[PDB]
Amino acid sequence: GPELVMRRGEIWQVSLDAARGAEANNQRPAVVVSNDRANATATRLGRGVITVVPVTSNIAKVYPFQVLLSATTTGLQVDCKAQAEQIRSIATERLLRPIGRVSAAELAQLDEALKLHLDLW
């Protein structure tokens, strides 16, 4: 049917609202990193969570578990960096608006960053 369509690697603005401590809070872009079967399921079941990697414009010092996302490739306003150490499963109701998608190269390094952060090698 007309279920929400959503693909790994897409950049969506999401509402993380009420967070504690150093958690990414408020509103920010985030990269979808859950696989696409789960992504379709979370919209047909409508009882769904998807997993995303939040993004910040405070680039500063970049760590090997973070990926630089260029404003030109992604449709973002400014350059940003995906923080694999902020990975979070979100209810689909936190999805606000699609912004774009990362490049294949960016997504591949994001996989590397996730494997480094979660020790999955």
Place this chain on the structure above:
Amino acid sequence: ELVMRRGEIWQVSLDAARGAEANNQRPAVVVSNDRANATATRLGRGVITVVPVTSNIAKVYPFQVLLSATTTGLQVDCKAQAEQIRSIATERLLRPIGRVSAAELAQLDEALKLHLDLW
């Protein structure tokens, strides 16, 4: 005392969750690497990534891992939900519970690889 290491089970406070997100307080498995974890211990504050656990084991998906009560410190058999993975502030940690077995941790690694499309 934030001395959490990978594979350990901690009671975490998942307040302010929305929708189908794991909520309330519950056990969770630390899955962030131990160098990040040790950084958090050393500074006394940080973020750690956990896999929330539910006692509802009515059905087990391939991205979920049944954890046995007999070895983990959990009162009953539970399941770890890779699709609920979540980076939490250290202030959400209430207390330590126990530790998954090595086999359970490796199974959780496979479930995380499946859920996140990491091959």
